Structures are given as structure tokens and as C-alpha cells.
Write a protein that binds this ligand. Structure first.
Ligand SMILES: Nc1ncnc2c1ncn2[C@@H]1O[C@H](COP(=O)(O)OP(=O)(O)OP(=O)(O)O)[C@@H](O)[C@H]1O
Ligand SMILES: Nc1ncnc2c1ncn2[C@@H]1O[C@H](COP(=O)(O)OP(=O)(O)OP(=O)(O)O)[C@@H](O)[C@H]1O
Ligand SMILES: [Mg+2]
Ligand SMILES: [Mg+2]
Lengths: 426, 385, 53
């Protein structure tokens, strides 16, 4: 067996040599972290590290007490509460007087709750519910306030103001789009007519529908047309909710819009976060329920809204609270639905507009062959047709190139039922 | 004999030299410098205590501090100081803390974690440029979507279209969907991520959404890349348990996956691959077309396709003069590509059974009847007859 | 002054689950429900006035 046998052992030793080579290599890596502009940072670096001045634990207020009327002395007092401003200033049968207030009860991120004092930098106007506050390593007492929650900087990303979307980038001039105009623009221009009729002007809308219709494109479309600044929150992209973190997510952006005038508060994708609670379910959550309870009251409070409109897109109306579905929160309801022939013509024309293709194509001709469909599928026919076109080595996709692309999606539909029909001869 | 010697001529001398070269150089690196860099290192070691508690950087506040969440139960406002920069850090990157008083003393990780280790692989692909025949067409559809933007982006720009993002391989077991993805990855010479979608899920709660983030985070650092999340079915619509101990975990984990795939941008530079048994083990909408192009349905080899698979196997085994290539096909009826490989393993065991060193006629014939018997139905021709 | 030192901050936050109060001369001796001679006290050496927190 000498031709392969001898050469087998030789193969083997090389592989083992290669394994050994990799363990020699990885035991030494690239030197070190030393950088000349941060060697000057070292001068300050020795002093602070050895000193008692970091780390500060992150805590956050979860319960507010007022530090007199609290019931701290319990000598000749009664209940769990005092006079709500005095408890030791009206009596010295306690044998004590104290003039400490706004003491506050924090929660650590280890889930351990403590009452703390106030520093030399703190006054009751620097602290609030839900605001991060730094406390000591050992014996605790607030040193410096940190801004509320982890929400700032992460929210601003989701918010885009003044969209670069109009009703050219939406195909179809659909029924829902005509009822959409009436909600935002019409009472903003003239709140006079609504007042005289004796209806209270529409300002709530819930856009809902199957996926892929483009409920969002429209919503953006009118935001630009009404020429209002746009504030977006997406409650399934932003998943901060833990112990009323998402109520702080809601509050900020609503609060910001309220300071401005001519605004759109678009609450998006609230199937989770500010949506259905899962107490009833097996999830046990009621963390999204704080987000819900806040959202309602912000609306209700804002009213009359001074022509600043609160909009809603949610995929399902099954994930909403029936308090939202009372008027004065949502007033108008639009289900987005499959576009008509020409509506599907238009979504094809925009996709095709971006392409560099032969112009002899007719948009109506393609969409005839197409069935009733979602916009997202018509995005797929153009991207698929593009791929067929380069493969055949045309720099154009002919009318014929889009008919092959349509057909493959349909053929799949046929595979899941039964193939072959009477339309091969009719 | 002569050419396996030629493989030995190329590999032995170049490889053996490479080990030896590394080994001397580790000494040699040291010798050029004897101050400056040595000094800076020396004081880095005085500053950084032993041990170092790991951190994870949540966010940077621009004032020479930051907030970390650490495997120590309470969070910390730490400072950024000593041999680290404000811009040497990015959020969500893993940092090294000082045991005594938590401070970011630098990074030597940069997204170094065990879930990263499972995911990255230095292994050799099993197939290279479709070693095993059959499914000629289906690979010229993966390639259009996945390989083709990486190799030539220019062609899509003349066309004026956006370039595809991702593919979904699905349908039949034993058709080597998981092996075509490995083939395509070797052809390009891309970065391959064998992570499995089922390796994010455990009983213990709240760990999972971190893991989903880390995949997209690492994939983008080493881009171009091909990401294969194999077996995303298990994390589908279904539930962990009907009692407890998992009511949350699947729900958070899936949702979190769709989000950071879309949130990149609509890229044609980090492709994803979802390998799944069906769309009936997942949610009815994924994320959901125009965005996930293209979908590839695997079905059973036809007579042409299963010939091709077979010819590969039979030639690597003794004899084929005994029973014609055609006579194997004829006897077989249409089945997945595993059933074709199965007949050949059984054939080889049968040559052992006889104690032959040839795959004889008798061996082929039995091995064909065996597989057909597993895997059987007869009411196709019983309804009929 | 000794009590004020305690009442001064920080201090742990907790909740009371239930209260269990027994009196002196529970058998003949003690506020506990055990058997030992003497040490009739409110809670000092013979515990029975208690909160479970
Ligand atoms: N009205 C339209 N005009 C042009 N293209 C459209 C239209 N509607 C949908 N599309 C196409 O479908 C893609 C994805 O769907 P889109 O973002 O519009 O939908 P949606 O139903 O609001 O979604 P989700 O469930 O993701 O929130 C768009 O980027 C676009 O290319
Ligand atoms: N085009 C092809 N590429 C790779 N192997 C193929 C091809 N066509 C058929 N095969 C055959 O199919 C066999 C089975 O492959 P394999 O069992 O790994 O399947 P899979 O569809 O990825 O499965 P699972 O559902 O078990 O994860 C291969 O070993 C090979 O014999
Ligand atoms: Mg949308
Ligand atoms: Mg597989």
C-alpha cells in the first residue's frame, strides 16, 4: 500500500504542525494600549484611582417622601404619615426636631431600596422621580444627579423632523389618504367651522393594516404637506420600558412637541411598549402597562390641543387599550388595504423611475399581469427583474424582463395548491 | 503517486518554515526598543491592578465619565481615564475595569465574548464550489443575490437598482441547503459566521437580547461578511414551555433579531442567511418582502439532478463496470440527495459483509432496495390500482 | 441620642409580612413557646413580640 500509506502519515504531520503553529501565534498579540496623548492623562490618573471619588453606584428614584411628615420619629406619632409637612416641629414630646425634607427613596440596579440624604450640590429642585442619581460605594447620600433614564440620545435617532416624503413617493390616491387629509390639515387651517357645527375637531387617527401597504409612507407624506415638524417614536424599535422607563420615553417627546407649535406626535408600532399588557398572558408583564397609563393621560391633558395633532400607527387594533378607542384619543380609523390596478401601476412607476431601463415600457401593462398585491411585493418584482437583467447582460430590463419576474412569485402560489389549469388554452 | 508528492513539496517546506519563523520572531520583536514604549507599558501595569473585573459600556457621557453595566449587580458611573481615549471607545463595546475603584483603563477586547467565539469559525468549508453535483439552478440564484454584490457592485449601479440583502433557504431535509451556503462562502473568500440561532436560547432569562445585538455588531466590524444564522425555526412563532421558565425568552429574542437586520440600512454588503425547515415553523410575516430577497424552495432531485449526485459517489468507490450508471437510476425512484448517499454507504458495508475489495453487482442491487423500504408509500399506486 | 444615630440616614427599606405577638408566662416562664426556666422579658431574652419583615 506504499503509494498512499506513506503519503498518508506525511499529510497528517503537516496538519498537526499547522495546529501547533496557531497556538504559538496567538500567545503573543499586538502591544499594548499605550498612546502618547493618554500618557499625560496618567498624571491625574493615579490620584483619582487611589482616592475615594469613584465609582458612584447608579441608583434612580422610585418613591418620593417628604422628609417631614414622613413618620421618621415614631415616639408619640401615629400611622405611617404625619401632617405632610410637620411631624417633629409641633411637638417635642418626640424630643426631637428636624428640618429635613425631600429625602427620597432610591432603587439600585441590584434591586435594593434605600433612603438617602442630599449632598451640597443637591436641592429638592435638582431631583425628581425617575431621575438617575449617583450615590456612594459605602454609606449612601446623593452627590450628583444624572439626567433621567437611558432614553436621551437613543430617542433623537428615531425622530426625524420635516420628512423628505410627499404624495409622490406613495402610489395610489387612496380612500384612506383622502380621510387622512381631513384629520391633520383641515382643523389646523380653520378651527372655526368645527366649532360652529358643534363637533370637536378630529385629531386622533389610527393607521392600521396588513404589512407592506405603506401606512408609514402616507403618514410621513402629510407631515411634510401640512408643513409641520415631525416627531417619531417607534415602540417596537425602542424597547426601553423597565419600571416606567418607557413612560419617560413617551413623556419627553410629547413634552417637547407641546413646547413647540405646529407638531405631529407620531406613535408608531405600539403593539409592544405602551400596548397590550401580559398580566392575562403567561408573560406576566405590566411594565408595558406603565407606558400605556402615561400615554392616555398625556392626550387627555393636552386637549384642546391648539392644533397640534397626535397620530397613531399600530399594525393591529387588537393591541390597544379600549381607553384609546374612546373618543378624544382616537377619532378616525383607517384600514390600509391592497391598491387598485392603477394604484399598483403607480408603485411600479416609482420603483422603475430609480432604475435605468429602456423607456418603451408601460406601467399599466405590467400591473395587469400582476394580481392584487402589496407594495412590498411590487418592490420585489423590480429588484428580481434587475437581477435577471444583468445576468442576461442587458443594462436595461425590457418589458419582457419584468414578466419573467412577476411569474416566479405566482408559480410559488401554484406549488402550494395544485398546478396546471384550463387557462393554457382559454 | 507523483502529484500527492507535489502537494507535499509545496506544503512541507513553506508551512514548516512558517512555524519556525514565528518562534524566533517572538524573541526578535523585543530587541529593537529599550525605552519609551517599555516605560509606558511599565506604568500601564502599575495603574492596572490584578485582577480586572469585566465591564460592558452602556454609554459615554462627554465630560470624562461614562456609565457601565457590569456582571456586578449595581451599575457604576465610571470615569474614562488613563491610556484610553473618549474616541477609542464606542458604545456597546466591552471595556476593562479596575477592581478597587471601577474606571475604564482601556479596551483589549472590542466585542470579544464567548458567543462571538462560537460564531466566528476558522474551519475549512466542507464543499468548495459545488463539489457534489445536483442543484445547479438553485445555486445560480443564491449567487445572484449574495456573491454577485460582493464580487461586482458596479453592475447594479448601471442598472440603477438597489442591491439585494439576504436569502432564505427552506423546504426539504437531505438536499444540502446548509452545504450550498458553505460552498458560496468559500467561492467568494468571505467571512463566514456559523452561528446557530438555537444557541442564544437558554432557561435563564434576560440573557438573550444581548446575543442578538452582538451578532449584528461583530458582522459589521469584519464586513464584508456572510452571516448564516442556521435553524431560526426553533425561535419562531412557537413557545418554550406552556408552564413557565421561558414565556418571555422566544418573544424578545425573535423581535430583537428582525430589528437590527433592517436597522443597519438596506445593505448589500452584509448578507444574512436564514436556514429554516419551513415558514410554518416561523411567524407568517417575517420582515417581510422587498428586503429579504430572495426565497429559495428546495424540493427533491429529479432524474437529471439525482444522476449528477450519484456519479460523484460511485467513482470514488471500487468498480462501475459491473452495473451501468443508468441501471442505478432506473431502479431508484425520486428521493432527496441523502437517500442517494445512503445507498452508496450501505453498498460499501455490503462489500465488507462479503469481504470483498470490490463493490460487486450483488452489493449495488441490495443497497438500492434497502433505502426504498424506509421511506415508503404505495397508496399512490393503490388509489390508482 | 443613641436612637437618633440609627434614625439618621441611610437605612434599608423593607416591608412587614406579618406580626407575631406573645406575652410573658406562656407556659409558666418566657414569652417564647419553648421550655426553659425564668427570663420573663418582652423580647430581650424571650422573644415573642416580633415582626417578620
Ligand atoms: N405606497 C408606496 N409607494 C411606493 N413603494 C411602496 C409603497 N408602499 C410600499 N412600498 C414599498 O414597500 C417598501 C416597504 O414597505 P413600507 O415601509 O412602505 O410599509 P408599511 O406597511 O408601513 O410597514 P411595517 O410593517 O414594516 O411598519 C417601501 O420601502 C417601498 O419600496
Ligand atoms: N447541490 C448540492 N449541494 C450539496 N450536497 C448536495 C447537493 N445536492 C444534493 N446533495 C446531497 O445531499 C446530501 C444531504 O445533505 P444534508 O444532509 O446536509 O442536508 P440539509 O438539507 O442541509 O439538512 P437538515 O434539515 O438535516 O439540517 C449531501 O450529502 C449530498 O449527498
Ligand atoms: Mg411601517
Ligand atoms: Mg441543514
Amino acid at each position: 500500500a506504499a503509494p498512499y500509506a506513506a503519503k498518508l502519515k506525511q499529510t497528517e504531520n503537516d496538519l498537526k504542525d499547522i495546529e501547533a503553529r496557531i497556538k504559538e501565534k496567538a500567545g503573543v498579540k499586538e502591544s499594548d494600549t499605550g498612546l502618547a496623548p493618554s500618557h499625560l492623562w496618567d498624571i491625574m490618573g493615579d490620584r483619582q484611582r487611589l482616592g475615594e471619588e469613584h465609582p458612584l453606584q447608579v441608583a434612580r428614584c422610585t418613591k418620593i417622601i417628604k422628609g417631614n411628615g414622613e413618620s421618621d420619629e415614631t415616639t408619640t406619632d401615629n400611622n405611617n404619615s404625619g401632617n405632610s409637612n410637620s411631624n417633629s416641629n409641633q411637638q417635642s414630646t418626640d424630643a426631637d426636631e428636624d428640618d429635613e425634607d425631600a429625602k427620597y427613596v432610591i432603587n439600585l440596579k441590584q434591586i435594593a431600596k434605600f433612603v438617602v440624604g442630599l449632598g451640597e450640590r443637591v436641592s429638592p429642585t435638582d431631583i425628581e422621580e425617575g431621575m438617575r442619581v449617583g450615590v456612594d460605594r459605602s454609606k449612601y447620600n446623593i452627590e450628583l444627579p444624572l439626567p433621567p433614564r437611558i432614553d436621551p440620545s437613543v430617542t433623537m435617532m428615531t425622530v426625524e423632523e420635516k420628512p423628505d416624503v410627499t404624495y409622490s413617493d406613495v402610489g395610489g390616491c387612496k380612500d384612506q389618504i383622502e380621510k387622512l387629509r381631513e384629520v391633520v390639515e383641515l382643523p389646523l387651517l380653520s378651527p372655526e367651522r368645527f366649532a360652529t357645527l358643534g363637533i370637536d375637531p378630529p385629531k386622533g387617527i389610527l393607521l392600521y393594516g396588513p404589512p407592506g401597504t405603506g401606512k408609514t409612507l402616507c403618514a410621513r407624506a402629510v407631515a411634510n404637506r401640512t408643513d409641520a415638524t415631525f416627531i417619531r417614536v417607534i415602540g417596537s424599535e425602542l424597547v426601553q420600558k423597565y419600571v416606567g422607563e418607557g413612560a419617560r420615553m413617551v413623556r419627553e417627546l410629547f413634552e417637547m412637541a407641546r413646547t413647540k407649535k405646529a407638531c405631529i406626535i407620531f406613535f408608531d408600532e405600539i403593539d409592544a411598549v405602551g400596548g397590550a399588557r401580559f398580566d392575562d398572558g403567561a408573560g406576566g408583564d405590566n411594565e408595558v402597562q406603565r407606558t400605556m397609563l402615561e400615554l392616555i393621560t398625556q392626550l387627555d391633558g393636552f386637549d384642546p390641543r391648539g392644533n397640534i395633532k397626535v397620530m397613531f400607527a399600530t399594525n393591529r387594533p387588537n393591541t390597544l387599550d379600549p381607553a384609546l378607542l374612546r373618543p378624544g384619543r382616537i377619532d378616525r380609523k383607517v384600514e390600509f388595504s391592497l391598491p387598485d390596478l392603477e394604484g399598483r401601476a403607480n408603485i411600479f412607476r416609482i420603483h422603475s423611475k430609480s432604475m435605468s431601463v429602456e423607456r418603451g415600457i408601460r406601467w399599466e401593462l405590467i400591473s395587469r399581469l400582476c394580481p392584487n398585491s402589496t407594495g412590498a411585493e411590487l418592490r420585489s418584482v423590480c429588484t428580481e427583474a434587475g437581477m435577471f437583467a444583468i445576468r442576461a447582460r442587458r443594462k436595461v430590463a425590457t418589458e419582457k424582463d419584468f414578466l419573467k419576474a412577476v411569474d416566479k412569485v405566482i408559480s410559488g402560489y401554484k406549488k402550494f395548491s395544485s398546478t396546471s389549469r384550463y387557462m393554457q388554452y382559454n | 503517486t507523483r502529484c500527492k508528492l507535489k502537494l507535499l513539496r509545496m506544503e512541507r517546506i513553506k508551512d514548516h518554515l512558517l512555524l519556525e519563523e514565528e518562534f524566533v520572531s517572538n524573541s526578535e520583536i523585543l530587541k529593537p526598543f529599550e525605552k519609551k514604549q517599555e516605560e509606558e507599558k511599565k506604568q500601564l501595569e502599575e495603574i492596572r491592578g490584578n485582577p480586572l473585573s469585566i465591564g460592558t459600556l452602556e454609554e459615554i457621557i462627554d465630560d470624562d465619565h461614562a456609565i457601565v453595566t457590569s456582571p456586578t449587580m449595581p451599575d457604576y458611573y465610571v470615569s474614562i481615564l488613563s491610556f484610553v481615549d473618549k474616541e477609542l471607545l464606542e458604545p456597546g463595546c466591552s471595556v476593562l475595569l479596575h477592581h478597587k475603584t471601577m474606571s475604564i483603563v482601556g479596551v483589549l477586547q472590542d466585542d470579544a465574548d464567548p458567543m462571538v467565539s462560537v460564531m466566528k469559525m476558522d474551519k475549512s468549508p466542507t464543499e468548495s464550489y459545488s463539489d457534489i453535483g445536483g442543484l445547479e439552478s438553485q445555486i445560480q440564484e443564491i449567487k445572484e443575490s449574495v456573491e454577485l454584490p460582493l464580487t461586482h457592485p458596479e453592475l447594479y449601479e448601471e442598472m440603477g437598482i438597489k442591491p439585494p440583502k439576504g436569502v432564505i433557504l427552506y423546504g426539504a431535509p437531505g438536499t444540502g441547503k446548509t452545504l450550498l451556503a458553505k460552498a458560496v462562502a468559500n467561492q467568494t473568500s468571505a467571512t463566514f459566521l456559523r452561528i446557530v440561532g438555537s444557541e442564544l436560547i437558554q432557561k435563564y432569562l434576560g440573557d438573550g437580547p444581548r446575543l442578538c445585538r452582538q451578532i449584528f455588531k461583530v458582522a459589521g466590524e469584519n464586513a464584508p461578511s456572510i452571516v448564516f444564522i442556521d435553524e431560526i425555526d426553533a425561535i419562531g412563532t412557537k413557545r418554550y414551555d406552556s408552564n413557565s421558565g421561558g414565556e418571555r425568552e422566544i418573544q424578545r429574542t425573535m423581535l430583537e433579531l428582525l430589528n437590527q437586520l433592517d436597522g443597519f440600512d438596506d445593505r448589500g454588503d452584509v448578507k444574512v442567511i436564514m436556514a429554516t425547515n419551513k415558514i410554518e415553523t416561523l411567524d407568517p410575516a417575517l420582515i417581510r418582502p422587498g428586503r429579504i430577497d430572495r426565497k429559495i424552495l428546495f424540493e427533491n432531485p429529479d432524474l437529471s439532478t439525482k444522476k449528477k449526485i450519484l456519479g460523484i459517489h460511485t467513482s470514488k468507490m471500487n468498480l462501475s463496470e459491473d452495473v451501468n450508471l443508468e441501471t442505478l437510476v432506473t431502479t431508484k425512484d425520486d428521493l432527496s440527495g441523502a437517500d442517494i448517499q445512503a445507498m452508496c454507504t450501505e453498498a460499501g458495508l455490503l462489500a465488507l459483509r462479503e469481504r470483498r475489495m470490490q463493490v460487486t453487482a450483488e452489493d449495488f442491487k441490495q443497497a438500492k432496495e434497502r433505502v426504498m423500504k424506509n421511506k415508503v408509500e404505495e397508496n399512490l399506486e393503490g388509489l390508482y390500482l | 441620642e443613641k436612637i437618633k444615630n440609627n434614625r439618621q440616614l441611610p437605612y434599608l427599606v423593607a416591608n412587614v409580612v406579618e406580626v407575631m405577638d406573645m406575652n410573658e408566662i406562656e407556659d409558666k416562664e418566657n414569652s417564647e413557646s419553648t421550655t426553659q426556666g425564668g427570663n420573663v422579658n418582652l423580647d430581650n431574652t424571650a422573644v415573642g413580640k416580633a415582626a417578620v419583615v
